[PDB]
Amino acid sequence: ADFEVHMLNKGKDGAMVFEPASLKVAPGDTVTFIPTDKGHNVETIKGMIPDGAEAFKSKINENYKVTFTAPGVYGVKCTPHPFMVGVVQVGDAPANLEAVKGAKNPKKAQERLDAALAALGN
Ligand SMILES: [Cl-]
Ligand SMILES: [Cu+2]
The CATH number of residue 20's host domain is 2.60.40.420
What is the CA(118)–ligand 2 centre distance, in A?
22
Experimental method: X-ray
The domain of 61 spans 1-122
Q: Where does the chain show beta strands of DSSP type E?
A: 2-11, 14-19, 22-25, 29-35, 43-44, 64-68, 72-78, 81-90
Give the residue ranges of DSSP H helices in 1-122: 97-101, 107-119
Q: What is the domain count for the chain?
A: 1
Is 6 a known ligand-binding residue?
no
Which ligand gives the minimal distance to the CA of 63?
1
Resolution in A: 2.0
> What gap in Å lies between CA 61 and CA 73, rounded to an integer?
24
What is the CA(34)–ligand 1 centre distance, in A?
8
What is the CA(79)–ligand 2 centre distance, in A?
7
SS3 39: coil
Closest C-alpha to 73, from 54, 112, 99: 99
Q: Is 72 in contact with 101 (CB distance < 8 Å)?
A: no
What is the CA(21)–ligand 1 centre distance, in A?
20
